[PDB]
Amino acid sequence: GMTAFSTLNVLPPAQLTNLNELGYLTMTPVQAAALPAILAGKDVRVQAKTGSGKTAAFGLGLLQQIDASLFQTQALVLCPTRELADQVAGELRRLARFLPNTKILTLCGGQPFGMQRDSLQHAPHIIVATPGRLLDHLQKGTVSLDALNTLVMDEADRMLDMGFSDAIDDVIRFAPASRQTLLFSATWPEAIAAISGRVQRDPLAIEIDSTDALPPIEQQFYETSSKGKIPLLQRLLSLHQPSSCVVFCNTKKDCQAVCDALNEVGQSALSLHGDLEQRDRDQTLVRFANGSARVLVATDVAARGLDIKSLELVVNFELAWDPEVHVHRIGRTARAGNSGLAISFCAPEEAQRANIISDMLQIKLNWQTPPANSSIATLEAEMATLCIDGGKKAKMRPGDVLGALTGDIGLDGADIGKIAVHPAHVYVAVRQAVAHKAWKQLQGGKIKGKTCRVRLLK
Amino acid sequence: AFSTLNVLPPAQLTNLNELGYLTMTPVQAAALPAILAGKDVRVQAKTGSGKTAAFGLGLLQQIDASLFQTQALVLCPTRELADQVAGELRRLARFLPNTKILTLCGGQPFGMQRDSLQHAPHIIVATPGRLLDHLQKGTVSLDALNTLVMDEADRMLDMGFSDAIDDVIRFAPASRQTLLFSATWPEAIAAISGRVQRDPLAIEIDSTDALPPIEQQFYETSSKGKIPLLQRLLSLHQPSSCVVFCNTKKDCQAVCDALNEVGQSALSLHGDLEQRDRDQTLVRFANGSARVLVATDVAARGLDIKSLELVVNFELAWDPEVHVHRIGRTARAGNSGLAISFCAPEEAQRANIISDMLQIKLNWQTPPANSSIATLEAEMATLCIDGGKKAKMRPGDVLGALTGDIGLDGADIGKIAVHPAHVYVAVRQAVAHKAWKQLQGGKIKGKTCRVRLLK
RNA sequence: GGGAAGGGUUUCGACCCUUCCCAAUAUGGCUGUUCGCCAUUU
RNA sequence: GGGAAGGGUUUCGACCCUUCCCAAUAUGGCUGUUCGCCAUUU
Ligand SMILES: Nc1ncnc2c1ncn2[C@@H]1O[C@H](COP(=O)(O)OP(=O)(O)O)[C@@H](O)[C@H]1O
Ligand SMILES: Nc1ncnc2c1ncn2[C@@H]1O[C@H](COP(=O)(O)OP(=O)(O)O)[C@@H](O)[C@H]1O
Ligand code: BEF
Ligand code: BEF
Ligand SMILES: [Mg+2]
Ligand SMILES: [Mg+2]
């Protein structure tokens, strides 16, 4: 049943070694079924489950035709959100370790335009982007989509909907028709699939898992009202006591209100919506990833594509407008063979929305009884996050950040979480008790023989 | 008088009085009204009669100090002439605050040009080589060009610069004003001149043989005896400023080496030296750090050296226009000058072509039966202080630093020239090393600067 | 560029504009006895 | 790019290229116990 990456017999041995080191020991169904047709040059439209590895699936076929000696853009990837753009760019950077000096650049809003322009002079090999800033660079004349080879659209059903299709049509004009086009998504409405064929030539359709074929996700539904949702959420949080929970809302107002309620209650919760600053969005995502926050209250911005390692619980505070969005947001848990729980709240006005979800997945809604009134148990964050002014621009790697952590300041390697290396900064998770001591001792410390400013993400 | 035509702003009229431009020269008074009216002009005038200011004054009335896009372009045959014209234009544009005038020419690194070119300058003085490179790489956008000036157009329009000038015009919009200035105009080039102009008005102030008060003497000598004759004549005239022109670069360097071997303090300017060396040599010779400057035809056009005493045609130029240009380096701005020319038996042809062009009988001189060879010591040396415009070095800064803080008074300090990356200052030879070694501290505008004796 | 402060669009994304504050060996302008003063930009 | 040493074109200009230093949160690539390796460009 298993299929190794060498069965494609077209990847270089360096790429096989890289995949073996990165932990890609066996191909997932999407990769095994789509890669040979992709790297043969076919325009492809691929559907797969949530968390089955479509990102690396198109990234391998993207990298296979990248001339590193050219130093010109020959691969473009389009994402619907900025955080997913960063994540896809990072996964592609890790995959592109068999090609030295492979410059991949991220173009999305929030970031400074001048820095992107100054970095865009040394033309990058691959560009992961959102249509907004990419359309700006194409109009001002900084991105050259001329020697372009592959154009990938991740979560393509969202990129071709009524909202993004106009910006996408504006973008594809700067791209040549003599290109390969890959359209990857987890859900494909037939009304969207019919229109999809306007950016591909004789596309190969690859539906791998059926519409109701989902990863191991147990679902529970609680019947409640609009006012009773917040106390019910607090009760369910104090009942299960999870470590990784994402609460999805339908508006930014509801999102921020639920976050404030869970915080005043005493349960560790951060907020991720489109009204905060992009710095706040990036740092909130980082903090929630490294366990500096128990709950992440987020709108549909964090519903597609995001890969939060070992997410335990998803809570539909309000059912999404479309059932595809429901599938995407419950797919945040049970990623890469894992399992998970997705509990959805249902007010009287949304009982119909839960029925299309029932008919689309062929599942019987496991309506659960709400818990009894109890005093709420607080959910504390296991650790905190330190932000160090450094990043890739300052040539800082996880090895030296960990070295400075267990070197002169004298801490323990077991009290250190994930070290994320961002372009301008580097974030490091440190257990709650040791966090403040580490921050105080690092302000007067030296990393790579240089004193660096550090801030405890309070 | 500059009170006429009622086009110049009141600030510029007061500015001209500050810079010493009291009266209008013939070329200026006859050309400016047609220039700042929008007409394309082709002007011929005396060497050293003010053509630079003539085209620069019209090249500043039609500039928008608010629009930070390019608006003018001047083309020169050499890099030093480009620097000179840029400095002249900056000195004129003191009435328009925050007026950026850039210099695009070879020898300079591409990086400073690329970085300073993102903030588009109002005027660009350039050589066709680097300007074309910037136009191809897409760093200069001539779409908003109002006026295009070509100084010494007969050299810019000959067969050597024909393809380059055409490729540069290719990037320029046709709807533009065009000014073509020169001292000499060969009729064959004047016929073709109309290809970059719209119904051009020809303004020939001075005739082709109407020269400034330059006295010319011709000496009969063999090829071997040229260098001894030069060493004897330099000792005999004992000049303060002398420029010796040669026909090849190796002849130039050899003549310079011989003049140094007889201890007559000569510097060299030719196309095989580093551009840093060329610029520093021109600076040193200008401020009086050398008595003799041996140069090829690179220094034959445009260069304005204040009160040049003597010109020496070691070899007669291949073309008569080049001869007129290289002898016009003396007797500028109403002064007089002397131009001695050696004529070997192999050069009698060109001496007649010259005599036909100027319509004068050649004064063939007889040297003394024998004269010794005296030395020629330079009156002062030059110090190069790092900084320039990066540190926003001002002449007042260098002057106030050299006085008191080191010891020497203002009488021992010569010409101060502020360049982009450095600043050069002339100091008497006696107080030269004392100044250098007391300047090693670094009391130069609160920032210690590396100073060096150019030697 | 880095901090603040707002609007516009807005189911959600992706976006579109406004004001101060400092940083800049980011660029330029200023009288020939210096250590400074103004204008654009990142 | 800051310093150098040259070659080619070579009537003269305007130009083209190479070798050694040096150093750049200039543009990126590289090992979860830090003070580094190398690919461009300036
Ligand atoms: N072949 C594989 N073996 C093991 N892990 C994989 C493999 N492919 C992908 N992964 C990991 O599983 C997760 C899949 O994330 P993702 O690619 O976004 O799934 P999808 O794109 O389908 O939503 C990532 O953490 C990825 O690194
Ligand atoms: N109206 C004027 N009055 C006095 N001096 C002038 C005037 N115009 C120009 N000059 C000076 O006389 C010299 C002429 O330089 P230049 O204009 O290049 O002569 P030309 O262009 O004819 O070869 C320069 O030093 C210039 O500053
Ligand atoms: F389908 Be996964 F969320 F990229
Ligand atoms: F035309 Be002049 F000699 F600069
Ligand atoms: Mg994905
Ligand atoms: Mg002139």
XYZ file of N, CA and C in Angstrom, chain A residues 151-292:
426
model
N 2.473 27.829 -12.108
C 1.564 28.704 -11.376
C 0.633 27.815 -10.563
N 0.766 27.875 -9.242
C -0.002 27.045 -8.325
C -0.981 27.934 -7.574
N -2.197 27.435 -7.391
C -3.217 28.100 -6.591
C -3.597 27.166 -5.452
N -3.176 27.517 -4.235
C -3.492 26.720 -3.060
C -4.835 27.160 -2.498
N -5.634 26.186 -2.067
C -7.038 26.411 -1.732
C -7.736 27.116 -2.895
N -7.661 26.468 -4.060
C -8.037 27.118 -5.311
C -9.518 27.471 -5.360
N -10.373 26.678 -4.708
C -11.801 26.981 -4.725
C -12.092 28.326 -4.072
N -11.250 28.746 -3.125
C -11.368 30.081 -2.555
C -10.769 31.136 -3.475
N -9.710 30.789 -4.209
C -9.075 31.737 -5.115
C -9.888 31.981 -6.378
N -10.847 31.110 -6.693
C -11.664 31.252 -7.891
C -13.104 31.637 -7.578
N -13.423 31.910 -6.314
C -14.785 32.258 -5.936
C -15.136 33.655 -6.448
N -16.345 34.110 -6.108
C -16.807 35.413 -6.577
C -15.913 36.545 -6.084
N -15.239 36.357 -4.951
C -14.446 37.414 -4.354
C -13.034 37.550 -4.887
N -12.345 36.424 -5.083
C -10.953 36.453 -5.514
C -10.777 36.341 -7.021
N -11.813 35.921 -7.754
C -11.647 35.646 -9.180
C -11.240 36.889 -9.960
N -11.702 38.065 -9.537
C -11.347 39.292 -10.242
C -9.868 39.618 -10.066
N -9.381 39.572 -8.823
C -7.962 39.806 -8.578
C -7.106 38.744 -9.256
N -7.590 37.502 -9.295
C -6.837 36.438 -9.950
C -6.757 36.683 -11.451
N -7.864 37.111 -12.064
C -7.832 37.462 -13.480
C -6.901 38.637 -13.737
N -6.835 39.586 -12.801
C -5.884 40.686 -12.940
C -4.445 40.188 -12.847
N -4.199 39.181 -12.009
C -2.838 38.687 -11.812
C -2.380 37.875 -13.017
N -3.211 36.933 -13.470
C -2.822 36.016 -14.534
C -2.517 36.726 -15.844
N -2.899 37.999 -15.973
C -2.588 38.740 -17.189
C -1.090 38.984 -17.330
N -0.386 39.190 -16.215
C 1.058 39.382 -16.249
C 1.827 38.084 -16.464
N 1.145 36.920 -16.417
C 1.730 35.596 -16.555
C 1.555 35.072 -17.976
N 2.477 34.241 -18.457
C 2.340 33.693 -19.808
C 1.410 32.493 -19.838
N 0.749 32.319 -20.984
C -0.102 31.155 -21.186
C 0.701 29.883 -21.425
N 1.987 30.008 -21.760
C 2.866 28.855 -21.949
C 3.438 28.406 -20.602
N 2.528 28.067 -19.695
C 2.876 27.725 -18.325
C 2.157 26.449 -17.914
N 2.666 25.831 -16.854
C 1.958 24.759 -16.175
C 1.130 25.361 -15.050
N -0.081 24.846 -14.865
C -0.998 25.388 -13.872
C -1.514 24.271 -12.977
N -1.343 24.456 -11.670
C -1.784 23.503 -10.662
C -2.808 24.179 -9.763
N -3.946 23.524 -9.563
C -5.032 24.045 -8.734
C -5.303 23.027 -7.633
N -4.865 23.318 -6.410
C -4.987 22.376 -5.306
C -6.028 22.868 -4.313
N -6.931 21.975 -3.909
C -7.897 22.336 -2.879
C -8.396 21.077 -2.191
N -8.978 21.267 -1.009
C -9.588 20.166 -0.275
C -11.065 19.999 -0.601
N -11.742 21.081 -0.977
C -13.148 21.046 -1.356
C -13.305 21.704 -2.717
N -14.058 21.059 -3.607
C -14.294 21.566 -4.958
C -15.786 21.536 -5.259
N -16.490 22.644 -5.040
C -17.872 22.736 -5.521
C -17.909 22.651 -7.039
N -18.904 21.926 -7.555
C -18.971 21.692 -8.994
C -19.178 22.989 -9.766
N -19.875 23.960 -9.167
C -20.014 25.267 -9.797
C -18.671 25.974 -9.924
N -17.733 25.684 -9.026
C -16.393 26.252 -9.117
C -15.507 25.426 -10.042
N -15.686 24.103 -10.041
C -14.888 23.248 -10.912
C -15.193 23.512 -12.382
N -16.458 23.803 -12.706
C -16.806 24.116 -14.088
C -16.062 25.352 -14.578
N -15.949 26.373 -13.726
C -15.243 27.599 -14.088
C -13.727 27.426 -14.038
N -13.233 26.481 -13.229
C -11.794 26.294 -13.051
C -11.039 26.154 -14.369
N -11.669 25.579 -15.390
C -10.977 25.267 -16.627
C -10.567 26.448 -17.488
N -10.626 27.661 -16.942
C -10.266 28.864 -17.678
C -8.850 29.340 -17.379
N -8.074 28.567 -16.622
C -6.697 28.934 -16.310
C -5.790 27.740 -16.572
N -6.347 26.691 -17.174
C -5.615 25.471 -17.472
C -5.930 25.022 -18.892
N -4.995 24.282 -19.486
C -5.177 23.682 -20.803
C -5.241 22.168 -20.641
N -6.344 21.575 -21.099
C -6.664 20.160 -20.934
C -6.259 19.672 -19.537
N -6.890 20.187 -18.485
C -6.450 19.844 -17.131
C -6.810 18.415 -16.762
N -5.945 17.809 -15.955
C -6.179 16.478 -15.413
C -6.829 16.626 -14.043
N -8.037 16.090 -13.895
C -8.748 16.128 -12.626
C -8.339 14.931 -11.781
N -8.000 15.184 -10.517
C -7.559 14.138 -9.593
C -8.338 14.334 -8.294
N -9.519 13.723 -8.210
C -10.278 13.660 -6.965
C -9.890 12.373 -6.251
N -9.160 12.503 -5.150
C -8.574 11.347 -4.479
C -9.501 10.791 -3.414
N -9.992 11.649 -2.529
C -10.937 11.263 -1.494
C -12.290 11.885 -1.805
N -13.355 11.110 -1.613
C -14.685 11.577 -1.970
C -15.081 12.785 -1.117
N -16.245 13.352 -1.440
C -16.697 14.552 -0.743
C -16.919 14.291 0.742
N -17.381 13.094 1.100
C -17.633 12.745 2.491
C -16.467 12.014 3.145
N -15.385 11.763 2.412
C -14.214 11.091 2.968
C -13.367 12.113 3.712
N -13.362 12.034 5.036
C -12.693 12.997 5.893
C -11.696 12.304 6.815
N -10.720 13.040 7.343
C -9.783 12.460 8.316
C -10.492 12.098 9.610
N -9.858 11.280 10.470
C -10.507 10.881 11.729
C -10.833 12.060 12.633
N -12.047 12.595 12.505
C -12.504 13.731 13.297
C -13.850 13.365 13.904
N -13.895 13.236 15.228
C -15.159 13.065 15.932
C -15.837 14.421 16.088
N -17.139 14.467 15.817
C -17.896 15.710 15.845
C -19.053 15.603 16.827
N -19.235 16.656 17.620
C -20.325 16.753 18.578
C -21.034 18.084 18.382
N -22.358 18.066 18.498
C -23.180 19.251 18.303
C -23.968 19.537 19.571
N -23.942 20.793 20.008
C -24.665 21.240 21.189
C -25.720 22.255 20.773
N -26.966 21.999 21.161
C -28.065 22.908 20.865
C -28.102 24.003 21.925
N -27.976 25.258 21.496
C -27.922 26.384 22.419
C -28.480 27.622 21.725
N -28.404 28.756 22.417
C -28.856 30.039 21.899
C -27.668 30.984 21.772
N -27.924 32.153 21.182
C -26.857 33.128 20.963
C -26.254 33.592 22.282
N -27.105 33.905 23.261
C -26.601 34.379 24.544
C -25.943 33.261 25.342
N -26.458 32.039 25.235
C -25.903 30.920 25.963
C -24.660 30.297 25.373
N -24.157 30.823 24.253
C -22.996 30.215 23.609
C -21.724 30.453 24.414
N -21.496 31.697 24.847
C -20.269 32.012 25.582
C -20.163 31.228 26.887
N -21.189 31.180 27.750
C -21.076 30.309 28.933
C -20.908 28.844 28.573
N -21.574 28.384 27.511
C -21.403 27.001 27.075
C -19.974 26.746 26.614
N -19.379 27.710 25.909
C -17.987 27.569 25.495
C -17.066 27.491 26.705
N -17.279 28.371 27.686
C -16.467 28.332 28.900
C -16.618 26.997 29.623
N -17.846 26.474 29.680
C -18.094 25.205 30.357
C -17.404 24.050 29.642
N -17.509 24.001 28.311
C -16.850 22.937 27.561
C -15.334 23.049 27.642
N -14.802 24.272 27.719
C -13.362 24.436 27.876
C -12.899 23.950 29.244
N -13.644 24.283 30.300
C -13.302 23.786 31.628
C -13.562 22.291 31.774
N -14.362 21.702 30.882
C -14.659 20.277 30.974
C -13.566 19.432 30.328
N -13.231 19.723 29.070
C -12.239 18.922 28.363
C -10.815 19.258 28.786
N -10.559 20.512 29.173
C -9.235 20.988 29.559
C -8.213 20.622 28.488
N -8.282 21.225 27.298
C -7.340 20.851 26.237
C -6.065 21.676 26.269
N -5.153 21.391 25.342
C -3.930 22.164 25.178
C -3.927 23.022 23.926
N -4.580 22.566 22.858
C -4.639 23.282 21.588
C -6.093 23.321 21.141
N -6.709 24.497 21.210
C -8.098 24.672 20.810
C -8.236 25.919 19.951
N -9.019 25.802 18.883
C -9.297 26.910 17.975
C -10.805 27.104 17.913
N -11.258 28.316 18.223
C -12.674 28.671 18.221
C -12.939 29.563 17.015
N -13.798 29.096 16.113
C -14.109 29.802 14.877
C -15.401 30.594 15.025
N -15.365 31.854 14.606
C -16.519 32.738 14.615
C -16.757 33.272 13.208
N -17.903 33.926 13.025
C -18.300 34.411 11.712
C -18.025 35.893 11.498
N -17.753 36.654 12.557
C -17.430 38.068 12.423
C -16.243 38.407 13.315
N -15.563 39.502 12.966
C -14.465 39.987 13.796
C -14.968 40.431 15.162
N -16.161 41.030 15.208
C -16.728 41.465 16.481
C -16.968 40.279 17.407
N -17.646 39.244 16.903
C -17.868 38.044 17.706
C -16.547 37.411 18.117
N -15.564 37.419 17.216
C -14.256 36.853 17.526
C -13.616 37.563 18.715
N -13.499 38.891 18.632
C -12.854 39.646 19.701
C -13.656 39.573 20.995
N -14.989 39.550 20.897
C -15.811 39.463 22.098
C -15.636 38.119 22.792
N -15.605 37.027 22.022
C -15.379 35.709 22.608
C -13.992 35.637 23.233
N -12.992 36.225 22.572
C -11.648 36.242 23.145
C -11.631 36.976 24.481
N -12.228 38.169 24.525
C -12.256 38.940 25.764
C -13.016 38.204 26.858
N -14.102 37.516 26.497
C -14.868 36.771 27.491
C -14.051 35.622 28.066
N -13.420 34.829 27.196
C -12.603 33.717 27.671
C -11.419 34.205 28.498
N -10.893 35.395 28.190
C -9.768 35.922 28.960
C -10.217 36.409 30.332
N -11.284 37.214 30.379
C -11.824 37.654 31.662
C -12.218 36.468 32.529
N -12.667 35.379 31.904
C -12.977 34.160 32.642
C -11.723 33.570 33.275
N -10.568 33.773 32.650
C -9.320 33.231 33.139
C -8.730 32.129 32.291
N -9.261 31.899 31.096
C -8.781 30.856 30.203
C -7.900 31.490 29.133
N -6.669 30.993 29.011
C -5.686 31.538 28.081
C -6.214 31.543 26.653
N -6.429 32.733 26.093
C -7.010 32.854 24.762
C -6.451 34.085 24.064
N -6.057 33.911 22.808
C -5.632 35.003 21.944
C -6.603 35.125 20.777
N -6.478 36.223 20.035
C -7.405 36.556 18.960
C -6.659 36.704 17.641
N -7.274 36.213 16.565
C -6.704 36.313 15.220
C -7.832 36.686 14.263
N -7.884 37.959 13.877
C -8.868 38.438 12.915
C -8.247 39.556 12.092
N -8.950 39.944 11.030
C -8.405 40.864 10.051
C -8.358 42.322 10.457
N -8.754 42.662 11.682
C -8.721 44.042 12.138
C -7.494 44.369 12.979
N -6.773 43.364 13.465
C -5.537 43.605 14.191
C -4.414 43.973 13.223
N -3.306 44.448 13.784
C -2.127 44.722 12.977
C -1.487 43.415 12.527
N -0.861 43.451 11.346
C -0.234 42.244 10.816
C 0.869 41.738 11.735
N 1.574 42.648 12.409
C 2.518 42.241 13.445
C 1.809 41.460 14.545
N 0.668 41.975 15.009
C -0.099 41.277 16.034
C -0.601 39.932 15.528
N -0.998 39.858 14.254
C -1.473 38.593 13.698
C -0.359 37.551 13.664
N 0.810 37.933 13.142
C 1.944 37.015 13.094
C 2.338 36.556 14.491
N 2.434 37.495 15.437
C 2.862 37.128 16.782
C 1.815 36.289 17.503
N 0.528 36.543 17.258
C -0.515 35.709 17.845
C -0.444 34.289 17.305
N -0.257 34.144 15.990
C -0.106 32.809 15.422
C 1.099 32.092 16.019
N 2.232 32.792 16.133
C 3.432 32.180 16.702
C 3.179 31.745 18.141
N 2.630 32.651 18.957
C 2.389 32.353 20.366
C 1.462 31.157 20.525
N 0.367 31.124 19.762
C -0.539 29.985 19.855
C 0.127 28.700 19.384
N 1.011 28.786 18.388
C 1.698 27.589 17.920
C 2.638 27.036 18.984
N 3.380 27.906 19.672
C 4.370 27.453 20.642
C 3.794 27.276 22.045
N 2.473 27.172 22.175
C 1.868 26.901 23.464
C 1.821 28.064 24.426
N 2.113 29.282 23.968
C 1.984 30.467 24.808
C 0.538 30.904 24.988
